[PDB]
């Protein structure tokens, strides 16, 4: 009766079902957990918001087209305006979180295409000016739930001031490595003939026990079309990709007034 | 007359010392001394002060 294809995930007041899964990835074989006393750093009693924040938040959907080059998000950036998770994140200097990432893309037995879904620790990307190095604005680095898109062309700016965004070049994974090697990162593939969802469970990953969520994204989420969407009756068809992410084992230190980041 | 002592931990055991000279002045650094009594400077008071009690009663 039980199947690798059929899964239920419940966190807080939120449940996901899938009937065409392909198992689930636990990044580096490690389930998220709270911070042990023997690895702790800040000494204030932490906030552990539990069910208020450790629940599935659904981002705005994106459209997969035959011409799409792919999508990226950063975490915790993508969830910074998500209910009580966002409030706990911005009221504290320090935060740590694991995640359940659930990527959703259904089609038909007549559609074809394959998405690589990668969770990348410290997903540092190239800037779009050759007048400077490491020259990216906070606003362009932290787009929130809208995330960004890859391109198949690199066109760095004439002026340094116009190039303060990522050069998200698909085949170099936006960071000067070949995309074919992205499989060294925790991943699943949504191959439309096989599965309609990817599930990745991510522990907290950093060189520290806890860090400044508003300064530092721990994970990149990359969705690359490895094989282009094709549908014989309409080559111009679009199918949605929906990203749903639950924080897990969230812990916050250094309470004060709320952080309100620059928007320009 | 080899002394075997604990090393200071690094990124990821013991070390051996033999004194070669007849004068202690020739010796390498004194071993780590973690002794301390801050109270002789931070609280040099004649009558005990209990933190939870009033300083002046």
């Amino acid at each position: 009766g039980y199947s690798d294809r059929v899964r239920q995930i419940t966190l807080g007041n939120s449940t996901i079902t899938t009937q065409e899964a392909a198992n689930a990835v636990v990044a580096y074989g490690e389930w998220p957990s709270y911070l042990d006393d023997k690895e702790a750093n800040p000494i204030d009693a932490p906030t552990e918001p539990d069910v208020s924040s450790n629940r599935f938040y659904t981002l705005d959907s994106v459209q997969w087209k035959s011409t799409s080059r792919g999508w990226w998000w950063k975490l915790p950036d993508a969830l910074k305006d998500m209910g009580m998770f966002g409030q706990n994140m911005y009221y504290h200097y320090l935060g740590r979180s694991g995640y359940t990432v659930h990527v959703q893309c259904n089609a038909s037995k007549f559609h074809q295409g394959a998405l690589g879904v990668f969770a990348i620790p410290e997903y540092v990307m190239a800037c779009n000016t050759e007048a400077k190095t490491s020259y990216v604005s906070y606003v362009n680095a932290n787009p929130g739930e809208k995330g960004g898109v890859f391109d198949n062309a690199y066109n760095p700016s004439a002026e340094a001031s116009e190039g303060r965004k990522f050069a998200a070049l698909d085949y170099l994974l936006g960071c000067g490595v070949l995309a074919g090697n992205a499989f060294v990162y925790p991943h699943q593939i949504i191959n439309l003939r096989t599965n309609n969802s990817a599930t990745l469970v991510l522990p907290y990953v950093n060189s520290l026990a806890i860090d400044c969520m508003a300064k530092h994204n721990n994970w990149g989420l990359v969705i690359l079309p490895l094989c282009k969407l094709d549908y014989a009756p309409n080559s111009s068809t679009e199918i949605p990709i929906t990203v749903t992410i639950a924080p897990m084992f969230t812990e916050f230190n250094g309470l004060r007034n709320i952080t309100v980041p620059a928007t320009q | 007359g080899a002394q075997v002592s604990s090393q200071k931990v690094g990124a990821h055991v013991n070390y051996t010392t033999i004194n070669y000279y007849k004068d202690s002045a020739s010796n390498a650094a004194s071993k780590l001394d973690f002794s301390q009594d801050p109270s002789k400077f931070t609280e040099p008071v004649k009558d005990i002060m209990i933190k939870t009690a009033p300083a002046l009663n």
């Binding site: 000494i43 009693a45 | 973690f34 931070t42 609280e43 040099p44 008071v45 002060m49 933190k51 939870t52 009690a53 009033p54 300083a55 002046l56």
Partner: peptide, 27 residues
């Protein structure tokens, strides 16, 4: 020998007032 660990503590509502002192004492 290590620098001081921090113990688990909650709040108080008490006649014990460790926040007040008198540095006139020389402490």
């Amino acid at each position: 020998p290590t620098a001081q660990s921090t113990p688990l503590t909650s709040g108080v509502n008490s006649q014990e007032v460790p926040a007040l002192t008198a540095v006139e004492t020389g402490a």
